[model samples]
Target: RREIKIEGDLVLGGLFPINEKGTTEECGRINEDRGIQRLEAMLFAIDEINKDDYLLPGVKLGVHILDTCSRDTYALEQSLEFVRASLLIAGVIGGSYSSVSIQVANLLRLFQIPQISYASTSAKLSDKSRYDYFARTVPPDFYQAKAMAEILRFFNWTYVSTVASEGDYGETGIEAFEQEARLRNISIATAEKVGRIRKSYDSVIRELLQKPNARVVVLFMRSDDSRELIAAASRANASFTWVASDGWGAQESIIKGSEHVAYGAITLELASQPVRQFDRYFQSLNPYNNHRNPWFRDFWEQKFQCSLQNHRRVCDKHLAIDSSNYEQESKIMFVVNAVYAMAHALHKMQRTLCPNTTKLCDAMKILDGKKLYKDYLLKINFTAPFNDSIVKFDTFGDGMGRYNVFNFQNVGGKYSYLKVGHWAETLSLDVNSIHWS
Candidate 1:
């Protein structure tokens, strides 16, 4: 039911945590369902591409979405499906987690299929020697880890406890952080590992809280992964200044899944700006009005918990999905760029290869991700007009990303996120320049 065959000339997609069998090895919550929202953003990007005459004339894009319950299991399975599809998939757009991306990359490498991610940031995945078909819209974890360590040093929180999700992002993230922490003479009180692939923590919070030396607890996990840990921490009545990785920082699931509990948190997230029209598009989501998205009905039902499953969805689908309710989730623009990265590459290929043609080239239908990836993906560079920022990949296929640091101060039991400092891909550290809470 997760894979919807939308009508189009080209086929492509990857794994998202849609309809995941809840987590913490227990049932997860609907509030943490950013996967579906992220997927909808992918749809938004595709729709925009279809409207543009220069990108792919007379060509429509279709996505075959799949739900990744566990990264190791579903990642390879779903990727295999994408490469093996009869529709001749142009390329895949997601697998937000690094472990999922890494696994899918292993599978996709066989077919030489392109896999572009907005989320996966593991430094290991940047190894072009192994993952030639893999590229990402975010910088690698090493930069984030160094920034996090510098943030800790800025506050002199030398003694801390580490909480990492058990896969690529967590393992590599924690490894990088530990190295940086050791360089700064920071001490780890105790470390507890949680599972993002599944959601079973071996009493990670209980053990994490037991460390008397833990003044700061660093979270290297997805937003949904924070759900289980937050509940456990709240239950244990544990209070500490927690530092968040880019994965969960500024995520709605982190604050809401934490049950709005009061805690001092310093989170590192990708620097972001509001989308002028994106918020408008989200507010205008009406299944009745937009017949282009057959999946909109399912999204409406899931988002509102209203059952139109038997399908009166188009007839009486009257619901105002307020954009103000989720204005905090501005990170979706990166996913928009993820799609555009490939689209632009395709654009460059079309313009350069078929320059002799007088009319719009319909040769886009026979476009191969393998050929375009080597010829254009590695070389194309541009500033995203959406935010006036550079969208260029480095030699490792990692974007030259900028990161924003926020201090979430729990004042009078009310949590508020405030921006402090930012780091860039140029290895420029400006920690002291931050105006803290």
Candidate 2:
């Protein structure tokens, strides 16, 4: 094992589902790796920070990325590397799924090392005392459940049922959705939990098909989990107006192949905004140049399916990372913002601690970083100029969670989404804005 060196540079530990287990798609299509694109946003932002003099002068940001996939043990296994005393990683930035986050957060809390998530929005993570070292860029599931409930009420879908995947991601979110819905006068017809991706969801589908009142079956699982259940529905010829959560809300696969099962469905999701100029950078990615990235060559191999040193090098250099065509989920920008927060906080820590030094204190050691938890992180409050919003933490270390309502519609024979409405921090669901499908 190579000993991690941290001197003048700050290192962040990144956990991503580079190749999520139980994924249905083949690796030949890199763009199909939706979660991986969010991970790319992490690198894109860090690369920008390294080039800029404004964020961290005389200090470079480095990272040790680990692909945790979808397993709890792998998530736990990868994080232990960050805890070694000599590494002194400034923080970790990942666990995109709530189930993975819950596992990693439990282990990370023992040490004071920060674990920042871009997309794990389960209500369980909001309890700061249980997981004090954790913080997230996306809103928690609490607000999402509220939005889902109100969306249902607005549409007069008073009775509904749900199929959720297991773990904190699905179970807690579905529980919150149920609680929110009941209080809104919406009665749940039935609800069932699918334990694992590889396990049987056919039984759950068969039972759901028998329910006449389960017209709107809310899908509270990740994309792969949703795919498996939806495929089962397609096979069984069972049709229901599917209501989805952010987990599989905007996934292209939901619309692409699962249209027979999940079409013209309404979904609740995190609001999206594109990262400025990331497309150009994404196109410029050449495995030849990005050799430092261990996965770059692998990505190139999968994308082009040709060796770099041979005639099969028909890779398109002009390819664009269009939102509709490639990894279109703009929630990746949240991942970018999360990394910015860590960098800015660390920069603040360095500047404050080494006020007299012309350069960043390369001498910053483990003990110095421990004080930063209070001296810098707790004090981190910044309004990002990129998006013009306050990117700071509340007392509980959670960022503002807002929800937007979207419904799938057939656009030129391709699955596309229409913005139906929004639910904001002000506790209002702007239902009139919805063009209900």
Candidate 3:
């Protein structure tokens, strides 16, 4: 048995475990594996939270592992089982992907369990009206789309084209991109829908290249589609500056063999500390591994046991993996702060102390934006006017988050910080601003 501690009346619980047996070919199993990784990180974070005395001294933290490792609705069923068994469990922190998070979050809402995901960025998950128990640390895909648009507009690239995949990530990104573009008066040259399985993008590139007025093309697709489209575009002599949303922010495939086409290509990300930090951490964990870089070339070679001659060739041969490493320390810092804030809320509601679901919900609402534990969170003041409710409840939740703009610089093969902006920043851009047109 493993033990963890939290301060005050706040109790923390996790739903993922370490080292689950599974293969990626099995959809449900892979999701569960990723969920375990996320949970491990969260557990590590909670340990730090206790050491700092961020919570009340007497509050005990506990973790409950539940296996939701099947795609056939077993995830929801397991969540229900956990809810039924653990009546004392107040909050949860696990669920790596959006699909699984949506299922688990819906179940938690029925039980009024507040949940915060480390990586689930699906826009639908933020709809509190649909699932009030949902919250996420990762910025949503819509914010990524807006960040991409902001960069394009900053460069005065008015005529832009968009290409996206068909799934939730792609579709939601495109929708946000279109709305933000329209608001900015940026002329969308073309919007194309692609598939996850398409082998070639020659036809798509040909169509986009024909749009002579398209000064920039924003890709709201994943690493796979971005790689294929970029490769095809490069071969076709498509010269427009290509932009990418966060979905395309993987350092592996984007930087590997396709260095030629990827040179001027730009993408946005969360503005993490430094690649060297991750490099050192990963290397320390895997000593005697000659390939030190976590980028695509090394990752592909390690996975496929072969060398990639070039970026385009690598794109053709290797399957792109999501390789953005959210440093565990960073995530831990956020969760630790959140735990402190939760404790502050509990203390404030001491007089009304009923641990019931309704009481907890009311406490969260009252504590929203009250600035309980400032030392822990970067900014913890949740204002009702801002709709910063711990339990999200509306379409406007999409606009409540914030992001920093970043541009990929070829010299360092790293993202450079540009500016920090919120949802209102998009609205601040003048429709007829000369800088954009």
Candidate 4:
């Protein structure tokens, strides 16, 4: 059972792709930082909110988190647990993929449950009637597509090939990219969709090899699919200058073993910053000290390659988390903000529902997400502690459109992502500073 339940006055729900989709089983290898870091970040946010005397004031916040295994079907199956609970399920926090969020939202909307996505950015979600219960800390893919188009315009790279994953995120994102490209007079050599099958990747690689004029390839794909494409391209001896969407954001784990293949790749990601408090908390975690997270032991063993107990692997020295170069994931701050949004929204709801009450009132015991959403969430305006940026949503529940442009290059003899510029309503790029392969 990939579930965690904590007892509190009110319970919040969460969804995350804890493990990659399995080829044979329900789940494959753990995603390490991509999934774990976000999970921990949410937990850290809950801890922060609970400790604050003013936020919920005597009332405690609890969580029920379930693993999605990075599959939409599996995520839908797991989400049933959220509504099935007798506890007052106030809001839900995730389902990173656009398709996963869509399916989850379809079910959550029926219960009038509010949802805040930390990463899912499909433009289709902005349709209030369809997904009125849904909101996100990240902006839609349309903003990112426009940013990509502007980058091409700046660099004078008119012709390019495109590959997108076979789902809502990819399908809608690529369509938006094409629309933006057409407006900018940028031509596409080929547009392909890569699915879960290896053949889809190989065929895309074949197309890239055949189109030498289209040296630049725009990828609106997940990091996992991006890696699969690179691996396939390596096997086929095909190479292209890659321009990526937020899905392939400067995550080092995406190109860990195959740095050369991703060298000189450019990616755009939702603007975020390192949370020192989260880093400090995460750095102090260990299998012995942290039992609340069921997957932490597995992560610790996998990370150190040593068993805590009853396994073939043995430790040679004292195991400790590396604080020397530990960096929080790119979406850490967004996850933190998502959790805080729920806290603030609920805090506002509590104050109005129960006048001058510090405890969960009779009315608060049966929380109405519908009331909380309209009365508080949509009108929430607070400064995010992590980034110190104002976290405010538009009337459509979309966040302020902002992006950080990154370039994957050799930085101080190490392959890493360097901040190239930023993109908001306008693109601000330093063309001369970028290292072109």
Number of the top lDDT candidate? 4
What residue runs in model 3 are displaced by over 4 Å at the alpha carbon?
A: 1-11, 17-37, 52-54, 67-72, 197-200, 273-344, 351-437
* Best first by lDDT, ranked: 4, 2, 1, 3
Q: Per-residue lDDT tens digits of candidate 1, residues 184-273?
A: 999999877875332355378668767877768877876667766777667677666778887767655566645334255678877777
The best candidate by TM-score is 4
What is the Cα root-mean-square deviation between model 2 and the actual structure?
4.9
- Pairs that clash in candidate 1: 24-199, 25-199
User: Candidate 2: which pairs clash?
Assistant: 139-401
**CA lDDT, every prediction?**
0.71, 0.72, 0.53, 0.86
**Model 4 global lDDT (CA atoms, 0 to 1):** 0.86
What lDDT tens digits, residue by residue, belong to model 3 across residues 397-419? 22234444433443355533233
* Model 2 misplaced regions, further than 4 Å: 1-7, 19-40, 69-71, 74-77, 85-88, 154-159, 192-217, 222-242, 255-264, 309-331, 355-358, 361-371, 410-415, 426-437
Residues 1-437, candidate 2: write the lDDT tens digits: 22223333678888877665645542223333544566667778887888897888787888877777566787788788888744458788888777888898898777778888987777888785887778888888777777777767877899898888887678877888888887888988888898754347788888887788668887778777887887888777777888888877766776656675676677877776776677666656666565555666656667556665455766665543355456545667778878988887788777777787635565564435446555566567787646666777776668777777776767576557777666775434445443332
TM-score of each: 0.74, 0.77, 0.67, 0.82
Q: Please count the clashing residue pairs in each candidate, in the order shown.
A: 2, 1, 11, 0
Better of 1 and 3 by lDDT: 1
By lDDT, is 1 or 4 better? 4
lDDT of 4 by residue, 334-382 (tens): 8899999889999888888889778889898888878887778989999
